[PDB]
Amino acid sequence: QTRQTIVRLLSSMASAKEISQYLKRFSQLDAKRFAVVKVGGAVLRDDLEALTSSLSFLQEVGLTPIVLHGAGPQLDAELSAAGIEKQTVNGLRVTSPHALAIVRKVFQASNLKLVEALQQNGARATSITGGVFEAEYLNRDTYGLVGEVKAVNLAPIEASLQAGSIPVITSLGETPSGQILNVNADFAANELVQELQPYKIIFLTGTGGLLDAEGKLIDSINLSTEYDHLMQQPWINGGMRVKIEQIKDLLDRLPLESSVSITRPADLAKELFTHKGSGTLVRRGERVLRATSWDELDLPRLTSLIESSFGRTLVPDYFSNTKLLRAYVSENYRAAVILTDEGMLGASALIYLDKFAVLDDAQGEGLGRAVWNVMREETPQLFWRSRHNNQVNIFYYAESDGCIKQEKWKVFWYGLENFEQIQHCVAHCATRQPTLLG
Amino acid sequence: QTRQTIVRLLSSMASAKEISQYLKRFSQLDAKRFAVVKVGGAVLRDDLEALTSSLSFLQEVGLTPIVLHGAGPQLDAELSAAGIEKQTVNGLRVTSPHALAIVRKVFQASNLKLVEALQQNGARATSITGGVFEAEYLNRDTYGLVGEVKAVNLAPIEASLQAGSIPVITSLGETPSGQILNVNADFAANELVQELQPYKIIFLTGTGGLLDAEGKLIDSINLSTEYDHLMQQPWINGGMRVKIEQIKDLLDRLPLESSVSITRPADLAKELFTHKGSGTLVRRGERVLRATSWDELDLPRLTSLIESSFGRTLVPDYFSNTKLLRAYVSENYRAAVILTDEGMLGASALIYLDKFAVLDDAQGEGLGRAVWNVMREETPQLFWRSRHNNQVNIFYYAESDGCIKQEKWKVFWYGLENFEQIQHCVAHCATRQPTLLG
Amino acid sequence: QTRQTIVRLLSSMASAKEISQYLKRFSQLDAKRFAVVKVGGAVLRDDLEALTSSLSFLQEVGLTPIVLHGAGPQLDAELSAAGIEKQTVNGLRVTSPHALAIVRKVFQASNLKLVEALQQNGARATSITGGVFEAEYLNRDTYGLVGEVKAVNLAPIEASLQAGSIPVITSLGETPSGQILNVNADFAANELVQELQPYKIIFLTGTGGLLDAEGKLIDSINLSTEYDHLMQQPWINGGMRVKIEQIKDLLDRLPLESSVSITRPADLAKELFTHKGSGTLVRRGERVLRATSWDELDLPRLTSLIESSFGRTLVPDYFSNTKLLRAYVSENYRAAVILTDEGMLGASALIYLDKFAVLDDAQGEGLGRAVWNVMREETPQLFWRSRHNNQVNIFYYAESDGCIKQEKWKVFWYGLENFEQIQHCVAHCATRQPTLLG
Amino acid sequence: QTRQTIVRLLSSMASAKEISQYLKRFSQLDAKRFAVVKVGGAVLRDDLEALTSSLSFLQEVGLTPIVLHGAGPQLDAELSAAGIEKQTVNGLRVTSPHALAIVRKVFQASNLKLVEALQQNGARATSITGGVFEAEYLNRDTYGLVGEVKAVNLAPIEASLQAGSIPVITSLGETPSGQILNVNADFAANELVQELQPYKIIFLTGTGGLLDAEGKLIDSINLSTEYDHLMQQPWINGGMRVKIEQIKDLLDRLPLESSVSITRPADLAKELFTHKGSGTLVRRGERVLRATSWDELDLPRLTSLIESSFGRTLVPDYFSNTKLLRAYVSENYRAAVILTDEGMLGASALIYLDKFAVLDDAQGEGLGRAVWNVMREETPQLFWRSRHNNQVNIFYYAESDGCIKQEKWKVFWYGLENFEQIQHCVAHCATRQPTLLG
Secondary structure (H helix, E strand, C coil), X not given: CCXXXXXXXXXXXXXXXXXXXXXXXXXXXXXXXXXXXXXXHHHHCCCCHHHHHHHXXXXXXXXXXXXXXXXXHHHHHHXXXXXXXXXXXXXXXXXXXXXXXXXXXXXXXXXXXHHHHHHXXXXXXXXXXXXXXXXXXXXXXXXXXXXXXCCECCHHHHHHHHHCCECCCCCCCCCCCXXXXXXXXXXXXXXXXXXXXXXXXXXXCCCCXXXXXXXXXXXXXXXXXXXXXXXXXXXXXXXXXXXXXXXXXXXXXXCCCCCECCCCCCCHHHHHHCCCCXXXXXCCCCCEEEECCCCCCCHHHHHHHHHHHCCCCCCCCCCCCCCCCEEXXXXXXXXXXXXXXXXXCCCCCEEEEEEECCCHHHHCCCCHHHHHHHHCCCCCXXXXXECCCCCXXXXXXXXXXXXXXXXXXXXXXXXXCCHHHHHHHHHHHHHHCCCCCC | CCHHHHHHHHHCCCCHHHHHHHHHCCCCCCCCCCCCCCCCHHHHCCCCHHHHHHHHHHHCCCCCXXXXXXXXXXXXXXXXXXXXXXXXXXXXXXXXXXXXXXXHHHXXXXXXXXXXXXXXXXXXXXXXXXXXXXXXXXXXXCCECEECCCCECCHHHHHHHHHCCECCCCCCCCCCCCECCECCHHHHHHHHHHHHCCCCCCCCCCCCCCCCCCCCCCCCCCCXXXXXXXXXXCCCCCHHHHHHHHHHHHHCCCCCCCCECCCCCCCHHHHHHCCCCCCCCECCCCCEEEECCCCCCCHHHHHHHHHHHCCCCCCCCCCCCCXXXXXXXXXXXXXXXXXXXXXXXXCCCEEEEEEECCCHHHHCCCCHHHHHHHHCCCCCCEEEEECCCCCCHHHHHHHCCEEEEECCEEEEEECCCCHHHHHHHHHHHHHHCCCCCC | CCHHHHHHHHHCCCCHHXXXXXXXXXXXXXXXXXXXXXXXXXXXXXXXXXXXXXXXXXXXXXXCCCCCCCCCHHHHHHHHCCCCCCCCCCCCCCECHHHHHHHHHXXXXXXXXXXXXXHHHCCCECCCCCCCECCCECCXXXXXXXXXXXXXXXHHHHHHHHHCCEXXXXXXXXXXXXXCCECCHHHHHHHHHHHHCCCCCCCCCCCCCCCCCCCCCCCCCCCCCCCXXXXXXXXXXXXXXXHHHHHHHHXXXXXCCCCECXXXXXXXXXXXXXXXXXXXXXXXXXXXXXXXXXXXXXXXXXXXXXXXXXXXXCCCCCCCXXXXXXXXXXXXXXXXXXXXXXXXXXXXXEEEEEEECCCHHHHCCCCHXXXXXXXXXXXXXXXXXECCCCCCHHHHHXXXXXXXXXXXXXXXXXXXXXXXXXXHHHHHHHHHCCCCCC | CCHHHHHHHHHCCCCHHHHHHHHHCCXXXXXXXXXXXXXXXXXXXXXXXXXXXXXXXXXXXXXXXXXXXXXXXXXXXXXXXXXXXXXXXXXXXXXXXXXXXXXXXXXXXXXXXXHHHHHHHCXXXXXXXXXXXXXXXXXXXXXXXXXXXXXXXXXXXXXXXXXXCECCCCCCCCCCCCECCECCHHHHHHHHHHHHCCCCCCCCCCCCCCCCCCCCCCCCCCCCCCCHHHHCXXXXXXXXXXXXXXXXXXXXXXXXXXXXCCCCXXXXXXXXXXXXXXXXXXXXXXXXXXXXXXXXXXXXXXXXXXXXXXXXXXXXXXXXXXXXXXXXXXXXXXXXXXXXXXXXXCCCCEEEEEEECCCHXXXXXXXXXXXXXXXXXXXXXXXXXXXXXXXXXXXXXXXXXXXXEECCEEEEXXXXXXXXXXXXXXXXXXXXXXXXXX
C-alpha cells in the first residue's frame, strides 16, 4: 500500500533510484524489525511534543518505533536533592541501595511521562519498564549496583509489537534472581538491536548530529573506508570517538543494509525518508581494495557484475584487451570502477572512467557512492561518458565539474584547468571517447 | 449510552429495581475504578478461551477489567523439574535465588500468554509485570526471598486505563532498592483494591464458588449479620475460613456498595449483571440491631426514613400510638422493619409487618434483603399488607407463603398451618389489616 | 457476543423466558433483515435528537435500522407558501408538476437533514432518496402525479447494509421510464417489508401509541383473536381503523414471529428490548378454536405437544380418561389449554386447568398469552396447579387472584368470592388437586 | 500530518521545489474540494481492481475522490439485446421511454457495482445515483428523453464528504418536476466542477492519455500558449479536438492552480503526486506577451517581481541601463525572462539570459516552465549564468545543452555548434558573464 506510492513520489525525482531500492529490499519483514529509535533524557526533558509527534507518525502508518529512552539529565538532578551524586570511578558511574531506589522512580516517572504523551497525541505507546535486560553485575562494592547487559528477552516487546504499539523500553537491568541494578544505556542498545535485527536505527540527541573540523553537519560516514581518515584525524576530540566506535561495534553485527543515523526529532521524518534529513547517516559499507593490475581480480565475477549492472554482457574478450591503470572493487564484488588510461601523446595523458558497475542491491546501501568516493581521492582529473537514458546521470552531474551532451552520449570531466588549458583537454575526451565503443 | 438501556432491559422485570439502582449510584466514576478481576493459575492453565472471552466483553463496552493473575499450579511444576520444591515453613511458602529466577520467568511467561490471548481474541491487554508492588521483605533466611506488600504504585496501571486496556498485572514484589522477592497474591489484592477503590470486584477460581453443609452454591453472604451463624458453624472446614476472613478484611476497606463475588469465568457476565450469576456474592452489609422497645430508637430518623422510603410522611403522631413488639434497624438508618402485634383474642395473636422502610440507595446493596432476612429467623409466623402499585411486591411473593388480592390491598402470610388451622387465621389478617390504615 | 449477555440480563428475571426466546429464534439472519423503523415528518420536525439518538443505538451494536421517513407536516407548509395546497380528491391527495418539484426538494432537504444528524451524533446514515420504489401511476389528471408502489428494488439498500449504515430511505416513486411521482408512505412500507422480510418493525409517531375507550396505552393487540372485539367495537373512531387494518395487511405477509410496534422515539429502546416499552405491540397470533368435545381434536398432536411442552409424555391412556369441559387450541397446535371439570357435589362444581401446553418457539410470540387470554374471557372462575420449579409460575402469579404453596405444588385461583364463600371453595382445589397426579 | 512529510520526501529531490509548492498553496481547504475523478464505462467494465485500489488510496489518507462514472460500453450492449440501439441524430444521441428504463437500470447496476467494490476493498463508497443534476430537456421528440444539465445540487454530495466517503455519482438528469432524462457525461462534469471548485481533477480513460504526431504520451499542454501550435496543427484528428476544447472550457472556470490530467488508473497515484505520472497534464497557464522594447512594460511590477523572486531588489537604476533585445512576461506579472544582447564584436553576438523571475506561487503551476518554454522556441542559441546555491539549477541542467562550473557561478549554453565552433563561443559566455554582476 504505502510502498506502492512511497516509490512513486520517488521514481520521478533525483535521489529516488537509491532510496526506492531501500524500500524494495526490506519491504515486508516483521514489524518490530523496523526502527529502534533509542532516545535520551536531554531530549525528553527538553523537546517532547516533537519527539512524540514524530514517533506517532511512523507507528501510525505501520513502521512501529520500538523506542528506548534513558532519562539522565533529570535523574542527575532528582538524585542530588537528597544527595549522594558524586563519584564515577571508571569511564562509567556508581550507585547505592537507597539510590537505584531513586533512579527506578525517575526511570519509571519519565518512562510513563512518555508512554502517555504518545497516547495523548493520538499514538499507542505501552510502557515496558522491566524484565527485558539480563543485567548480570560487573562489580559489587567498587561500583555497587551497576551491570553489563548479559542478554535480552524480547517477549516483553514482541507482545506490544504484535498488538501494534510503541514498546517504550528502558535502561534498566535485573540480575538473574531479579535484583534491578543499573546498566549503560548504550552498551544496552547494542544488545537489543543485536537481538532484534533492525533495518533503520536512529540515535536521537538534543544536538543535531555529528560535526567536523569546521563544525558542519557531516551527513555521512562509511567506516570500512572513511574510518581511518577520521579515526586518526584529531578533530575527533574525546567521546565522539566512542560515539563512533560504538556505532561501529553495532553494524558489524547487522546485515549490510542497516545504518545508524544520529539526528534530531523535529527532523526524524526528513532523516528516515530522505537521502538527506539532517543527521549524520553512518553505514559499515564494505572493504574496498585498490588494484593496479588487471590480473589480481576475479574477472569472471566482473562479468556477472557487468552483466547484472549493465544490460548485455561485456563485448567478448574485452577483458584480455583492457589495459588497466587503477582498479576499485568492493570485497563482495557488487561494485567496481575500472580506471583506464586514455589519450594521445604517449599512452597518457588523461585518466578515464571506463566502467561504473553497481548492483541494484547496492547503490541503495550507498556503495556506488563509497567506491567512487574512494577513487576521486586518488584520481583528481577525471573524464567519463554516459549515455542519455542512463539512470545515474544525476549522480554524475553532481560530481561532474562540467558536462556536455550529444544525442548519443553525455560527457563529464572533473578538475580545474585554466581557461586555455581546459578547452584543449576537454575537446579530447570528446574525441577519444566517441571511439571507445566504436 | 449503555446504562440508558441496561436499565431498560431492567425496569420491566423482577430483580430490576435492585440492580438498576446499582447502575445509577455508580455510573460515571473513573474507568480503572470498575472491576478488579483477580484470577489464578488453575484457571489460566485450564480454561482461558472463556477467561479471556469474558474479559474482552467488559473492556469492549467500557468496563475495563483491571486483571490480577498469579499462576501457581504451573509454576509449582516448572519449578520442581530442576527441583527445590519442598518446605513451606509458615502458613505460606519459601523461595531461594536460583528460584525467584524460575518464578519470574513463569510469572512472565503466562502473564504474556494472557496479554496476548486477549489481543488475539480482539481485546487490548497490556502486560504490567513489575514496579507496582512495594514488597518489603518479611524474613531473610527463615523464608528467603518473600515479602509483604508494604504499598502500591498505581501509575503503571493508570497508564493502561487511560489508554483503555486490561492492565494484566502480577503477584510480584520489588523491595525498595529494587530486588524482586515473592508476595502473597491474596494479601496482594487486598492492597491494590484498597488503593484503587473498586466497585465490583470478582475472584475467579476454577471451582464454582462457595459451598454449604449440603454442598450447594451459596449465592450470598452478608457478614455484619450472617457472619456468626457461619464463622462458628463447622461446615467451614479450613482455608474456606481464611477465604472468608480475607474478603471480610477487604470490604471494611471499601465503600458499602462494593462486594466481592467468587465466580467462574464462563459465568462472569451472568454474575456481574444478574441478581444471580453463579458465584457466592458477598457484601459487608451493616450492623443491625434488634429493638424490643419503641423508645430506644431515633424515631425522627425513622420519619425521614419513612418520608423518604414512602411517598408522604407518617400520619402525624403515629409514633406515640405505635405499640411495638419487635423492631429491626440498620445502624445507618437506611432500613427498618417495624413488627407490631395485631389480632383479637387478648393483644395477640398474630405478629404483623407494619412497615418495611428501605432507602433507594439500599435495596440495591441488598439491605432490604439483609434486615428482613434477620427477622424471618426470629419471627416465624408472618402476615403483612402491601398495595397493588407497590414496587417490591415481587420480593414479597418470594417470601410470602401464600397471597391474596384486593383492588385496594395485597395480603401475604408466612408459615405452615394445618388445613383447618390456616383458613381461620388467614381470614383474620384480611380483617384486622383492612382497618390499620382506616 | 451481545446475545450471550442480552439473555443473561434476561434469564434471572421475570419476562425473561419469553424474550430471550425471541433472541434465540432470530439471532443470526442477515443484517438488513432486522428492524424497519418507518418514521414520519411530525416526529422529524419535532423531536430529532431522540429519534436519532435511538437509531444510533441499534446500528452501533449491530442491529441496523433501515429507516423510512416521509416528512409531511413541513412539506404541507413549504408547499402552500407559493400555494396550490388544496384538493385531496380521494382518501389520499393530488399533486401537479410545479409541485412534486416542491416535495422532492422537501423530501430531499429533510432526508439529508436526518442522514447528517445521525453522522453528527456518531452514527453512519447514508441517504437513499430514489430508485427504490417502482411507483406505477394510478391516475393521470384526476390526481396528477401520484402512484401505487408496484414493486421494490433492494439493491440501493442492500448496499448500505453491506457497508453497515442506516439506509435512510424515502416516500417517493419513479415510474418505469423514470418519472418521479408521489406515493403513499404507508402503502409503501407494506411493500418494502414484504420484500425485506423483517423481524421487528417499529412505527414511530409523535403521539405515544394506540389508545382505548378510556384512553390508556393499549400495550398489545393480537388480531386473529382480539381482532373482532375491537374491529366492531366503536371506540375505534376513523383512521385508527385504517391504522389497524394496514398493520394487519402486513403481518399476514411475514413469518409469525414478526410484530409491528407503534411507539415513541425516546422509548424506542424500551420497546425493542422489553415485554413492555410504551408502544402498542401488535402481532397476528394464530387462529384459535374452542372445543367442547375431546373428540374433535388431533390428540396425537397434543402428545408431541405435551411431550415437547412437558418433560415426559402424558401418562399413557390419559387421553381416553380425560373428561373434557372446554378446550382451547391454536390452529398450529403449538398451544393448548385443557379445561377439565373437577369438584365433589355432582360432576361439578369448579372448573379446572388440567394442562397448559406452549412450545418453546411460542411463549415468545406471545401464544401462551393469547390462548389463555381467550379462555379467561369464557371461563371466569379458575383454579389450577403448578409445581415449584415450573418456569411460567410468574405468568400465573400475574393472573392468579390468589395463591398458596406446598413444597410439592403451588395453587392458584381466579375470581372474587365473598369472605365466607372463598375459604370453602379454596380448600377444595387444594384437596381434589393433590389427587389429580396421584 | 501528511504534508509534513509529503514535502519531506520532496524537498531533498529534483522536481520537489515545484510540487511541494503545490502542497502548500492548497493544503487545508474543504475535503470535497479535492479531486473530482470522473471515470467511464470502458474502464469500469475492464479494469476495476485498479480503479478502486487507487480510489481507496486517496480517500484512505484524507483526499476524498468525489468520483463521477458514466458506464456506456456495457449500457450500449444491454440496450440492444431487446433493441432500439440506432440513431444518434446530432453530435450526441437519442433515447425513448422503454429506454431510459434500460439505462437507469444499467447506470444503477454498475454504479452499485462500484460503490460495493470500494467497500469490499476496504474503502467507504456511498452511491449517489440521483437528484444532483437539474437536467432541463433540450428537445422533446427530435431526441426524446435527453437534456442539458441546467444546474447542480451539491447537498447530496456534501453529505457523503462530511461523513467522509467517495460520493460515487452519476450521468443522469432529472427535469424540474422530476422526470429523469439522459445527459452528456462530459457537459456534466464541466458543471459539477464549476459548482465544487476542485483543485486536482483527473479524467480516467482506458487508454493512457493524449497522443502526438509520433504517438508518444504528451505529458503536458498549457493552452494560453501551446494552444495554437496545436489547435491548428492537423495531428489533432477529430474528437481529440473536442476532448481538448472541453478541458479548455473548464479551467477558464477554475482558479489558475487547477489542472485536468487524463491518465490511467493503475497510474493514478503516480500522476497525482509526481511531476510525471503518465497522463497528459493540462493547465490554462496565462496569457504571455513578447516585448521587443523595454518601455512597453510595467517595470515597477518587475521590481516587486525581482524583489520577490530574488533575495534583494535590483541594483538601483539597473532598469534605465538595461538594453533589451527580447522580453517575455505573463499577463499577471508573476513570471519574466529578460533577454539581453551580450558579446564583443559589435553589440552582438550572443543572446543572453539576464533574468528569470518566477514567484513562489508559480513554478508550481508550471509558469516558470511555460514562459521559458516560449522563448526557447523563439531564441535558439542560449547562454546564461546561475549561482551555486540557486534552487532551480536542475531545471537548467535539463535545458542546458552543456554546463560548466565555478565556485562563484554556474554556466549553461543551449544549441549545437561544431567542434571548433563551440569552444570559441563557449569561452565567451564565461568571460563576458563574469562581468555582468561586476
